[PDB]
Amino acid sequence: SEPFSDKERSEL
Amino acid sequence: VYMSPLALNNLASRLLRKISLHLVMQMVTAVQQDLGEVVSVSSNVTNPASACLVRMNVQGVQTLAVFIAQSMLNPNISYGMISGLTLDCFSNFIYGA
């Protein structure tokens, strides 16, 4: 639960 | 490509569409809670160290990385405009560093 991963170039 | 606007615009257009970075970061929270301990944040005192721990967002890292990325694929498609270049910005160690 510590790391939340991000795919970048995301329109959140 | 560098001779025709149209041709270059398409090069750039595609150069950007392809960019994809995959990063993993800790919880915005936990990092605060951690430095918060390392510096001893008095929830009453306003001081440099304490203040910066709030302008800490994830979106920033996204934008920053993606930039670092394209800026590395082809130097002739785009430029960046740095923000906050005050005359003596360097006297603000954080920004400076």
Side-chain angles (χ1 to χ4, degrees):
Chain A
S1 33
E2 347 171 326
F4 76 101
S5 57
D6 302 301
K7 276 215 69 46
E8 280 151 53
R9 246 249 151 246
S10 279
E11 308 171 314
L12 295 175
Chain B
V1 292
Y2 296 124
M3 201 147 296
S4 162
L6 176 57
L8 180 65
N9 182 65
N10 292 334
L11 183 160
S13 187
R14 172 117 49 187
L15 173 321
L16 287 158
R17 292 181 181 185
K18 201 58 182 180
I19 291 184
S20 186
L21 300 173
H22 187 69
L23 285 180
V24 267
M25 297 154 308
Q26 279 166 281
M27 286 290 255
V28 223
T29 314
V31 192
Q32 300 183 319
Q33 225 287 292
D34 185 13
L35 296 172
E37 295 178 9
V38 192
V39 293
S40 178
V41 180
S42 314
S43 76
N44 286 312
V45 184
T46 315
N47 83 289
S50 172
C52 82
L53 301 183
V54 191
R55 289 173 202 162
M56 209 161 243
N57 63 156
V58 200
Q59 184 161 60
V61 165
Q62 288 191 53
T63 311
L64 225 283
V66 64
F67 179 66
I68 301 171
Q70 44 172 286
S71 295
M72 171 262 312
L73 297 189
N74 187 149
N76 316 290
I77 269 52
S78 70
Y79 67 80
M81 211 73 94
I82 289 178
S83 171
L85 266 167
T86 301
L87 169 64
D88 77 330
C89 58
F90 271 111
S91 291
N92 172 354
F93 78 117
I94 275 187
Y95 183 93

XYZ file of all heavy atoms in Angstrom:
826
model
N 0.839 -1.247 0.000
C 0.000 0.000 0.000
C 0.871 1.296 0.000
O 0.348 2.412 -0.192
C -0.971 -0.049 1.215
O -0.360 -0.726 2.326
N 2.191 1.123 0.201
C 3.202 2.226 0.224
C 3.449 2.785 -1.163
O 3.587 4.017 -1.336
C 4.603 1.766 0.702
C 4.631 0.397 1.349
C 6.039 -0.131 1.618
O 6.979 0.142 0.820
O 6.187 -0.850 2.634
N 3.619 1.876 -2.154
C 3.855 2.495 -3.446
C 2.640 2.568 -4.371
O 1.999 1.552 -4.677
C 4.989 1.631 -4.037
C 5.448 0.644 -2.874
C 4.108 0.478 -2.171
N 2.278 3.771 -4.788
C 1.212 3.815 -5.764
C 1.956 4.087 -7.105
O 2.737 5.036 -7.207
C 0.103 4.846 -5.377
C 0.445 6.326 -5.597
C -0.045 7.013 -6.733
C 1.159 7.064 -4.630
C 0.166 8.416 -6.902
C 1.376 8.470 -4.787
C 0.877 9.139 -5.924
N 1.777 3.224 -8.110
C 2.462 3.398 -9.406
C 1.765 4.333 -10.424
O 0.529 4.349 -10.526
C 2.680 2.021 -10.041
O 1.435 1.340 -10.178
N 2.553 5.106 -11.180
C 1.970 6.010 -12.184
C 2.469 5.824 -13.630
O 3.678 5.704 -13.887
C 2.173 7.475 -11.776
C 1.564 7.794 -10.424
O 0.323 7.615 -10.239
O 2.350 8.221 -9.547
N 1.513 5.754 -14.561
C 1.811 5.646 -16.001
C 1.838 7.123 -16.407
O 0.821 7.827 -16.281
C 0.674 4.974 -16.804
C 0.635 3.447 -16.848
C 0.122 2.971 -18.218
C 1.172 3.279 -19.286
N 2.529 2.847 -18.775
N 2.964 7.611 -16.913
C 2.987 9.017 -17.254
C 2.733 9.510 -18.670
O 3.226 8.986 -19.687
C 4.233 9.651 -16.670
C 4.026 9.956 -15.186
C 5.318 9.901 -14.397
O 6.275 10.597 -14.816
O 5.383 9.168 -13.370
N 1.937 10.572 -18.660
C 1.433 11.288 -19.809
C -0.047 10.980 -19.622
O -0.774 10.710 -20.589
C 1.964 10.701 -21.115
C 2.871 11.664 -21.856
C 2.167 12.118 -23.126
N 2.558 13.452 -23.575
C 1.743 14.508 -23.595
N 0.471 14.410 -23.185
N 2.199 15.669 -24.051
N -0.463 11.002 -18.347
C -1.847 10.701 -17.941
C -2.726 11.941 -17.721
O -2.306 12.906 -17.066
C -1.866 9.842 -16.650
O -1.645 8.460 -16.916
N -3.938 11.919 -18.275
C -4.862 13.033 -18.074
C -5.726 12.670 -16.817
O -6.970 12.595 -16.882
C -5.722 13.248 -19.339
C -4.918 13.392 -20.679
C -5.846 13.378 -21.897
O -6.729 12.483 -21.914
O -5.708 14.229 -22.821
N -5.028 12.455 -15.683
C -5.602 12.079 -14.362
C -7.108 12.307 -14.179
O -7.755 11.433 -13.558
C -4.853 12.796 -13.215
C -3.374 12.475 -12.953
C -2.883 13.409 -11.854
C -3.175 10.980 -12.593
N 13.211 16.498 -43.070
C 12.224 16.891 -42.076
C 12.414 18.300 -41.579
O 11.444 19.014 -41.367
C 12.266 16.013 -40.843
C 11.805 14.608 -41.175
C 13.667 16.011 -40.291
N 13.662 18.700 -41.378
C 13.954 20.032 -40.867
C 13.810 21.153 -41.892
O 14.024 22.327 -41.579
C 15.362 20.045 -40.290
C 15.533 19.146 -39.095
C 16.508 18.154 -39.083
C 14.750 19.312 -37.957
C 16.708 17.350 -37.966
C 14.941 18.513 -36.832
C 15.924 17.536 -36.846
O 16.143 16.753 -35.739
N 13.430 20.798 -43.111
C 13.287 21.781 -44.165
C 11.853 22.212 -44.367
O 11.585 23.299 -44.868
C 13.814 21.197 -45.457
C 14.172 22.230 -46.467
S 15.569 21.610 -47.418
C 16.923 21.482 -46.122
N 10.934 21.346 -43.967
C 9.517 21.604 -44.123
C 8.783 21.650 -42.808
O 8.799 20.685 -42.053
C 8.884 20.520 -44.981
O 7.480 20.517 -44.810
N 8.097 22.765 -42.528
C 7.343 22.922 -41.286
C 6.449 21.727 -41.077
O 6.564 21.009 -40.085
C 6.545 24.192 -41.530
C 7.476 24.988 -42.349
C 7.968 23.972 -43.356
N 5.560 21.510 -42.031
C 4.647 20.394 -41.933
C 5.349 19.093 -41.540
O 4.938 18.398 -40.619
C 3.928 20.215 -43.260
C 3.018 18.992 -43.264
C 2.014 19.097 -42.130
C 2.313 18.892 -44.594
N 6.424 18.778 -42.240
C 7.173 17.558 -41.991
C 7.733 17.464 -40.596
O 7.798 16.381 -40.020
C 8.302 17.451 -42.983
N 8.166 18.600 -40.070
C 8.747 18.651 -38.744
C 7.672 18.608 -37.694
O 7.856 18.046 -36.621
C 9.552 19.927 -38.567
C 10.197 20.054 -37.198
C 11.230 18.962 -37.002
C 10.839 21.402 -37.096
N 6.543 19.218 -37.998
C 5.463 19.228 -37.045
C 4.986 17.815 -36.819
O 4.573 17.454 -35.719
C 4.301 20.067 -37.544
C 3.172 20.124 -36.543
O 3.335 20.664 -35.442
N 2.024 19.551 -36.903
N 5.029 17.011 -37.868
C 4.588 15.639 -37.733
C 5.623 14.838 -36.973
O 5.283 13.917 -36.234
C 4.335 15.011 -39.101
C 3.146 15.621 -39.807
O 2.225 16.141 -39.171
N 3.147 15.546 -41.130
N 6.890 15.186 -37.152
C 7.935 14.476 -36.446
C 7.702 14.728 -34.976
O 7.632 13.806 -34.182
C 9.313 14.991 -36.848
C 10.485 14.257 -36.203
C 11.728 14.509 -37.009
C 10.665 14.710 -34.783
N 7.570 15.990 -34.616
C 7.342 16.332 -33.228
C 6.058 15.684 -32.708
O 6.055 15.031 -31.672
C 7.277 17.841 -33.079
N 4.965 15.855 -33.432
C 3.702 15.286 -33.005
C 3.853 13.826 -32.599
O 3.407 13.422 -31.534
C 2.671 15.415 -34.122
O 1.391 15.003 -33.675
N 4.496 13.038 -33.445
C 4.695 11.626 -33.167
C 5.710 11.342 -32.053
O 5.538 10.403 -31.282
C 5.126 10.922 -34.446
C 5.553 9.480 -34.250
C 4.634 8.545 -35.009
N 4.446 8.995 -36.382
C 3.591 8.436 -37.227
N 2.849 7.401 -36.834
N 3.466 8.927 -38.453
N 6.772 12.141 -31.990
C 7.816 11.998 -30.971
C 7.158 12.074 -29.610
O 7.532 11.367 -28.699
C 8.828 13.142 -31.097
C 9.989 13.448 -30.137
C 9.596 13.234 -28.699
C 11.157 12.590 -30.481
N 6.174 12.947 -29.479
C 5.487 13.121 -28.220
C 4.469 12.050 -27.904
O 4.386 11.590 -26.770
C 4.825 14.485 -28.198
C 5.885 15.566 -28.038
C 5.339 16.870 -28.537
C 6.313 15.660 -26.580
N 3.687 11.653 -28.896
C 2.676 10.631 -28.670
C 3.269 9.357 -28.079
O 2.645 8.704 -27.242
C 1.954 10.288 -29.978
C 1.074 11.404 -30.519
C 0.350 11.005 -31.812
N -0.480 12.106 -32.317
C -1.292 12.031 -33.374
N -1.396 10.894 -34.058
N -2.009 13.097 -33.746
N 4.483 9.019 -28.497
C 5.141 7.794 -28.051
C 5.651 7.766 -26.616
O 5.747 6.699 -26.008
C 6.306 7.459 -28.991
C 6.741 6.002 -28.939
C 5.562 5.103 -29.280
C 5.896 3.625 -29.203
N 4.698 2.798 -29.552
N 5.976 8.927 -26.067
C 6.517 8.973 -24.722
C 5.668 8.315 -23.670
O 4.495 8.642 -23.513
C 6.788 10.394 -24.282
C 7.946 10.963 -25.092
C 7.146 10.409 -22.829
C 8.367 12.340 -24.681
N 6.282 7.393 -22.939
C 5.598 6.680 -21.870
C 6.562 6.305 -20.748
O 7.442 5.470 -20.932
C 4.941 5.412 -22.416
O 4.148 4.788 -21.418
N 6.396 6.916 -19.584
C 7.266 6.611 -18.468
C 6.486 5.873 -17.405
O 5.297 6.119 -17.209
C 7.826 7.896 -17.894
C 8.623 8.675 -18.921
C 9.011 10.020 -18.361
C 9.843 7.878 -19.302
N 7.149 4.958 -16.714
C 6.476 4.209 -15.667
C 7.232 4.395 -14.363
O 8.260 3.763 -14.157
C 6.436 2.731 -16.036
C 5.621 1.898 -15.097
N 4.247 2.005 -15.013
C 5.984 0.952 -14.197
C 3.800 1.159 -14.099
N 4.833 0.508 -13.589
N 6.728 5.256 -13.487
C 7.388 5.511 -12.212
C 6.576 5.039 -11.026
O 5.354 4.991 -11.096
C 7.634 7.003 -12.027
C 8.744 7.703 -12.805
C 8.762 9.162 -12.418
C 10.091 7.072 -12.498
N 7.259 4.702 -9.932
C 6.590 4.287 -8.695
C 7.059 5.205 -7.591
O 8.259 5.393 -7.412
C 6.960 2.883 -8.272
C 5.959 1.912 -8.825
C 8.362 2.563 -8.740
N 6.128 5.777 -6.842
C 6.519 6.679 -5.771
C 5.770 6.390 -4.496
O 4.680 5.824 -4.527
C 6.258 8.119 -6.179
C 7.074 8.568 -7.359
S 6.213 9.879 -8.209
C 4.628 9.114 -8.427
N 6.353 6.781 -3.371
C 5.703 6.560 -2.098
C 4.483 7.440 -1.980
O 4.196 8.237 -2.866
C 6.656 6.862 -0.967
C 7.586 5.741 -0.685
C 8.716 6.179 0.191
O 9.672 6.810 -0.271
N 8.613 5.868 1.475
N 3.758 7.281 -0.881
C 2.559 8.068 -0.637
C 2.971 9.496 -0.335
O 3.879 9.727 0.463
C 1.789 7.498 0.554
C 1.056 6.220 0.256
S -0.317 6.579 -0.826
C -1.657 6.464 0.356
N 2.310 10.456 -0.970
C 2.637 11.857 -0.739
C 2.720 12.056 0.774
O 3.630 12.703 1.282
C 1.547 12.790 -1.323
C 2.206 13.964 -2.028
C 0.631 12.011 -2.289
N 1.770 11.451 1.479
C 1.674 11.524 2.933
C 2.933 11.088 3.653
O 3.662 11.893 4.219
C 0.561 10.625 3.448
O -0.619 10.821 2.661
C 0.267 10.938 4.896
N 3.158 9.784 3.641
C 4.301 9.186 4.305
C 5.610 9.935 4.143
O 6.427 9.946 5.059
C 4.474 7.755 3.838
N 5.836 10.552 2.994
C 7.090 11.263 2.830
C 7.073 12.474 3.733
O 8.075 12.793 4.373
C 7.311 11.718 1.396
C 8.745 12.186 1.227
C 7.016 10.588 0.454
N 5.928 13.147 3.785
C 5.780 14.325 4.630
C 6.036 13.875 6.065
O 6.936 14.375 6.743
C 4.362 14.912 4.508
C 3.964 15.364 3.096
C 2.569 15.998 3.031
O 1.623 15.520 3.670
N 2.435 17.067 2.241
N 5.248 12.904 6.509
C 5.374 12.374 7.854
C 6.833 12.040 8.183
O 7.267 12.234 9.309
C 4.489 11.128 8.002
C 3.670 11.067 9.294
C 4.511 10.754 10.531
O 5.042 9.645 10.678
N 4.635 11.732 11.429
N 7.594 11.563 7.203
C 8.988 11.204 7.452
C 9.935 12.383 7.572
O 10.714 12.450 8.511
C 9.524 10.266 6.372
C 10.943 9.783 6.672
O 11.414 9.966 7.818
O 11.586 9.212 5.764
N 9.913 13.299 6.617
C 10.800 14.447 6.722
C 10.312 15.238 7.923
O 11.101 15.808 8.683
C 10.720 15.311 5.466
C 11.198 14.658 4.173
C 10.861 15.570 3.015
C 12.693 14.386 4.241
N 8.991 15.245 8.087
C 8.370 15.954 9.188
C 9.046 15.624 10.499
O 9.120 16.455 11.401
N 9.540 14.396 10.597
C 10.233 13.932 11.789
C 11.688 14.370 11.717
O 12.245 14.844 12.692
C 10.181 12.394 11.895
C 8.784 11.773 12.086
C 8.812 10.239 12.128
O 9.926 9.666 12.181
O 7.724 9.608 12.111
N 12.296 14.228 10.549
C 13.699 14.571 10.392
C 14.037 16.016 10.693
O 15.145 16.313 11.152
C 14.194 14.259 8.979
C 15.708 14.357 8.938
C 13.731 12.874 8.554
N 13.091 16.912 10.438
C 13.329 18.324 10.680
C 12.694 18.861 11.951
O 13.104 19.905 12.447
C 12.841 19.174 9.505
C 13.688 18.896 8.289
C 11.395 18.868 9.221
N 11.704 18.157 12.484
C 11.036 18.603 13.703
C 10.144 19.815 13.419
O 10.407 20.945 13.851
C 12.070 18.943 14.775
O 11.439 19.425 15.944
N 9.076 19.544 12.683
C 8.098 20.548 12.281
C 7.178 20.963 13.426
O 6.379 20.152 13.902
C 7.208 20.003 11.122
C 6.179 21.047 10.690
C 8.076 19.600 9.948
N 7.281 22.219 13.858
C 6.419 22.733 14.925
C 5.149 23.215 14.231
O 5.188 24.169 13.461
C 7.106 23.897 15.643
O 8.458 23.581 15.949
N 4.023 22.562 14.491
C 2.790 22.946 13.818
C 2.354 24.375 14.103
O 1.211 24.741 13.839
C 1.653 21.969 14.159
O 1.128 22.185 15.456
N 3.263 25.184 14.637
C 2.957 26.580 14.927
C 3.938 27.496 14.247
O 3.597 28.611 13.861
C 3.007 26.855 16.422
C 1.816 26.287 17.153
O 0.661 26.479 16.741
N 2.081 25.587 18.254
N 5.164 27.008 14.108
C 6.233 27.771 13.487
C 6.306 27.632 11.967
O 6.208 26.531 11.415
C 7.593 27.364 14.064
C 8.689 28.230 13.469
C 7.566 27.479 15.579
N 6.477 28.766 11.295
C 6.590 28.785 9.850
C 8.075 28.938 9.602
O 8.684 29.877 10.098
C 5.885 30.009 9.240
O 4.600 30.184 9.848
C 5.700 29.817 7.752
N 8.672 28.008 8.871
C 10.093 28.109 8.559
C 10.308 27.452 7.199
O 9.518 26.600 6.796
C 10.943 27.423 9.633
C 11.053 25.932 9.424
O 10.082 25.193 9.607
N 12.240 25.477 9.028
N 11.381 27.825 6.482
C 11.646 27.246 5.163
C 11.384 25.748 5.070
O 10.490 25.308 4.339
C 13.112 27.591 4.929
C 13.671 27.583 6.297
C 12.625 28.378 7.037
N 12.168 24.970 5.811
C 12.032 23.521 5.815
C 10.573 23.094 5.865
O 10.106 22.349 5.016
C 12.779 22.946 6.993
N 9.853 23.583 6.861
C 8.449 23.247 7.029
C 7.576 23.585 5.824
O 6.802 22.751 5.356
C 7.898 23.961 8.265
O 6.493 23.806 8.368
N 7.706 24.812 5.331
C 6.911 25.296 4.202
C 6.968 24.459 2.938
O 5.932 24.090 2.385
C 7.302 26.729 3.868
N 8.175 24.171 2.469
C 8.326 23.400 1.244
C 7.620 22.043 1.279
O 7.140 21.561 0.254
C 9.801 23.188 0.941
S 10.500 21.843 1.868
N 7.539 21.426 2.448
C 6.898 20.124 2.541
C 5.443 20.127 2.108
O 4.785 19.095 2.146
C 7.001 19.582 3.963
C 8.411 19.397 4.531
C 8.262 18.777 5.901
C 9.286 18.514 3.637
N 4.934 21.275 1.689
C 3.547 21.332 1.269
C 3.393 21.542 -0.226
O 2.406 21.104 -0.822
C 2.803 22.433 1.997
C 1.308 22.284 1.744
C 3.123 22.366 3.479
N 4.357 22.229 -0.831
C 4.328 22.456 -2.272
C 4.826 21.166 -2.914
O 5.350 21.168 -4.030
C 5.256 23.613 -2.668
C 4.772 24.986 -2.239
C 5.816 26.059 -2.519
N 5.600 27.226 -1.664
C 6.513 28.165 -1.423
N 7.720 28.086 -1.978
N 6.221 29.174 -0.605
N 4.656 20.065 -2.191
C 5.101 18.759 -2.643
C 3.935 17.999 -3.245
O 3.079 17.495 -2.528
C 5.673 18.002 -1.453
C 6.748 17.012 -1.782
S 7.687 16.642 -0.294
C 9.301 17.245 -0.749
N 3.902 17.927 -4.569
C 2.826 17.232 -5.268
C 3.377 16.195 -6.229
O 4.538 16.264 -6.629
C 1.979 18.218 -6.064
C 2.774 18.913 -7.150
O 2.207 19.380 -8.146
N 4.096 18.997 -6.964
N 2.526 15.253 -6.619
C 2.927 14.189 -7.523
C 2.878 14.642 -8.966
O 3.790 14.362 -9.744
C 2.010 12.982 -7.380
C 2.692 11.749 -7.934
C 1.619 12.803 -5.925
N 1.804 15.340 -9.324
C 1.637 15.820 -10.687
C 2.913 16.499 -11.181
O 3.317 16.323 -12.328
C 0.438 16.783 -10.780
C 0.135 17.267 -12.217
C -1.287 17.840 -12.421
O -1.683 18.830 -11.778
N -2.053 17.216 -13.335
N 3.562 17.258 -10.309
C 4.780 17.940 -10.700
C 5.823 16.987 -11.240
O 6.414 17.231 -12.288
N 6.052 15.899 -10.515
C 7.026 14.909 -10.931
C 6.647 14.343 -12.277
O 7.505 14.129 -13.123
C 7.128 13.760 -9.932
C 7.847 12.593 -10.563
C 7.886 14.220 -8.705
N 5.365 14.083 -12.483
C 4.947 13.564 -13.772
C 5.471 14.499 -14.857
O 6.366 14.141 -15.630
C 3.421 13.466 -13.850
C 2.823 12.341 -12.991
C 1.334 12.081 -13.277
O 0.928 11.865 -14.434
N 0.520 12.091 -12.222
N 4.920 15.706 -14.884
C 5.302 16.728 -15.853
C 6.817 16.831 -16.025
O 7.343 16.804 -17.133
C 4.773 18.109 -15.417
O 3.391 17.996 -15.069
C 4.915 19.124 -16.546
N 7.518 16.949 -14.914
C 8.957 17.082 -14.948
C 9.642 15.944 -15.695
O 10.466 16.175 -16.573
C 9.467 17.174 -13.514
C 10.505 18.254 -13.260
C 11.832 17.801 -13.782
C 10.076 19.531 -13.937
N 9.287 14.714 -15.345
C 9.879 13.539 -15.960
C 9.609 13.512 -17.442
O 10.545 13.448 -18.234
C 9.344 12.285 -15.316
N 8.334 13.560 -17.821
C 7.980 13.540 -19.237
C 8.819 14.557 -20.015
O 9.269 14.282 -21.123
C 6.485 13.849 -19.470
C 6.168 15.243 -19.020
C 6.153 13.741 -20.941
N 9.032 15.730 -19.433
C 9.833 16.758 -20.083
C 11.231 16.207 -20.266
O 11.733 16.110 -21.383
C 9.898 18.004 -19.211
C 10.734 19.118 -19.783
C 10.349 19.767 -20.949
C 11.888 19.549 -19.124
C 11.100 20.836 -21.452
C 12.647 20.614 -19.614
C 12.253 21.261 -20.781
N 11.857 15.836 -19.155
C 13.210 15.299 -19.197
C 13.330 14.276 -20.315
O 14.356 14.198 -21.002
C 13.573 14.618 -17.873
C 13.455 15.624 -16.731
C 14.984 14.059 -17.956
C 13.592 15.009 -15.376
N 12.254 13.513 -20.487
C 12.173 12.468 -21.491
C 12.234 12.981 -22.922
O 13.142 12.616 -23.663
C 10.917 11.672 -21.287
N 11.273 13.816 -23.317
C 11.261 14.343 -24.682
C 12.486 15.171 -24.955
O 13.141 15.019 -25.981
C 10.023 15.193 -24.946
C 9.663 16.152 -23.845
C 8.552 17.089 -24.261
O 8.780 18.002 -25.049
N 7.334 16.860 -23.747
N 12.800 16.046 -24.021
C 13.956 16.906 -24.161
C 15.199 16.108 -24.538
O 16.217 16.670 -24.953
C 14.197 17.635 -22.842
O 13.124 18.512 -22.545
N 15.083 14.792 -24.421
C 16.183 13.874 -24.664
C 16.110 13.088 -25.973
O 17.104 12.512 -26.424
C 16.249 12.950 -23.449
C 17.173 11.784 -23.554
S 16.300 10.293 -24.010
C 14.926 10.315 -22.896
N 14.931 13.099 -26.584
C 14.675 12.406 -27.839
C 15.093 13.182 -29.105
O 15.629 12.590 -30.052
C 13.196 12.037 -27.906
C 12.762 11.062 -26.813
C 11.362 10.596 -27.080
C 13.675 9.864 -26.790
N 14.858 14.496 -29.119
C 15.211 15.368 -30.249
C 15.212 16.815 -29.729
O 14.165 17.380 -29.407
C 14.190 15.194 -31.371
C 14.574 15.936 -32.636
O 14.250 15.493 -33.732
N 15.237 17.081 -32.495
N 16.399 17.421 -29.612
C 16.632 18.781 -29.131
C 15.937 19.869 -29.950
O 15.728 20.987 -29.463
C 18.145 18.901 -29.228
C 18.409 18.158 -30.473
C 17.652 16.884 -30.157
N 15.570 19.566 -31.190
C 14.949 20.600 -32.008
C 13.420 20.722 -32.067
O 12.921 21.478 -32.877
C 15.448 20.496 -33.441
C 16.934 20.283 -33.536
O 17.727 21.174 -33.245
N 17.322 19.088 -33.956
N 12.677 20.015 -31.227
C 11.215 20.072 -31.255
C 10.663 21.069 -30.254
O 9.708 21.795 -30.537
C 10.631 18.665 -30.928
C 10.439 17.870 -32.212
C 9.359 18.773 -30.128
C 11.679 17.809 -33.074
N 11.295 21.110 -29.083
C 10.812 21.967 -28.002
C 11.796 22.505 -26.963
O 12.863 21.918 -26.722
C 9.759 21.209 -27.220
O 10.381 20.149 -26.497
N 11.366 23.589 -26.306
C 12.127 24.251 -25.244
C 11.298 24.441 -23.972
O 10.074 24.468 -24.019
C 12.673 25.612 -25.723
C 11.661 26.721 -26.020
C 11.098 27.482 -25.000
C 11.322 27.050 -27.335
C 10.227 28.549 -25.285
C 10.450 28.112 -27.627
C 9.911 28.854 -26.598
O 9.057 29.898 -26.873
N 11.968 24.559 -22.833
C 11.246 24.757 -21.595
C 11.459 26.151 -21.035
O 12.517 26.767 -21.207
N 10.439 26.651 -20.354
C 10.504 27.965 -19.749
C 10.544 27.773 -18.233
O 9.532 27.411 -17.626
C 9.263 28.754 -20.125
C 9.506 30.227 -20.221
S 10.443 30.548 -21.710
C 9.040 30.917 -22.883
N 11.704 28.007 -17.623
C 11.850 27.841 -16.183
C 11.152 28.929 -15.415
O 11.249 30.101 -15.747
C 13.305 27.832 -15.770
C 13.950 26.542 -16.249
C 13.417 27.945 -14.274
C 15.402 26.448 -15.922
N 10.469 28.530 -14.357
C 9.713 29.458 -13.537
C 10.413 29.914 -12.254
O 11.143 29.157 -11.622
C 8.365 28.816 -13.202
O 7.656 29.579 -12.248
N 10.191 31.168 -11.884
C 10.778 31.688 -10.664
C 12.277 31.919 -10.641
O 12.947 31.524 -9.691
N 12.809 32.567 -11.667
C 14.234 32.843 -11.703
C 14.570 34.190 -11.102
O 15.310 34.974 -11.694
C 14.744 32.778 -13.128
C 15.283 31.386 -13.417
C 15.488 31.200 -14.904
C 16.576 31.199 -12.656
N 14.015 34.445 -9.924
C 14.245 35.684 -9.197
C 15.705 36.065 -9.244
O 16.565 35.209 -9.443
C 13.881 35.516 -7.743
O 12.511 35.131 -7.655
C 14.106 36.812 -6.977
N 15.995 37.345 -9.041
C 17.378 37.778 -9.071
C 18.247 36.978 -8.120
O 19.339 36.566 -8.489
C 17.513 39.258 -8.728
C 18.979 39.659 -8.500
C 19.813 39.509 -9.764
C 19.008 41.080 -8.020
N 17.785 36.756 -6.893
C 18.610 36.002 -5.958
C 17.938 34.715 -5.529
O 17.941 34.350 -4.356
C 18.976 36.864 -4.737
C 17.837 36.998 -3.743
O 16.659 36.964 -4.181
O 18.129 37.150 -2.528
N 17.360 34.024 -6.498
C 16.703 32.761 -6.229
C 17.680 31.793 -5.556
O 17.301 31.035 -4.666
C 16.218 32.153 -7.535
S 17.571 31.919 -8.693
N 18.942 31.823 -5.967
C 19.918 30.910 -5.395
C 20.135 30.990 -3.899
O 20.803 30.134 -3.328
C 21.249 31.046 -6.111
C 21.373 30.144 -7.291
C 21.386 30.653 -8.575
C 21.444 28.768 -7.114
C 21.466 29.805 -9.665
C 21.525 27.910 -8.201
C 21.535 28.429 -9.476
N 19.576 32.010 -3.263
C 19.715 32.166 -1.825
C 18.611 31.392 -1.125
O 18.437 31.480 0.091
C 19.668 33.642 -1.437
O 20.829 34.311 -1.897
N 17.851 30.640 -1.909
C 16.796 29.801 -1.365
C 17.287 28.390 -1.643
O 16.900 27.775 -2.633
C 15.479 30.040 -2.087
C 14.409 29.050 -1.676
O 14.673 28.098 -0.927
N 13.189 29.262 -2.172
N 18.147 27.891 -0.762
C 18.751 26.577 -0.919
C 17.853 25.528 -1.566
O 18.297 24.853 -2.484
C 19.283 26.079 0.426
C 18.228 25.547 1.326
C 18.246 24.214 1.714
C 17.197 26.364 1.763
C 17.252 23.698 2.524
C 16.194 25.854 2.576
C 16.221 24.517 2.958
N 16.605 25.382 -1.123
C 15.746 24.380 -1.752
C 15.660 24.587 -3.253
O 16.118 23.745 -4.030
C 14.330 24.387 -1.189
C 14.292 23.521 0.059
C 13.345 23.830 -2.212
C 12.915 23.330 0.608
N 15.058 25.698 -3.662
C 14.943 26.013 -5.079
C 16.324 25.819 -5.698
O 16.490 25.101 -6.676
C 14.507 27.462 -5.260
C 14.289 27.852 -6.699
C 13.027 27.750 -7.283
C 15.350 28.294 -7.487
C 12.827 28.081 -8.620
C 15.164 28.624 -8.825
C 13.901 28.517 -9.384
O 13.708 28.853 -10.702
N 17.317 26.462 -5.100
C 18.672 26.350 -5.593
C 19.078 24.921 -5.879
O 19.410 24.592 -7.016
N 19.050 24.067 -4.857
C 19.436 22.667 -5.015
C 18.661 22.001 -6.138
O 19.226 21.262 -6.938
C 19.227 21.908 -3.716
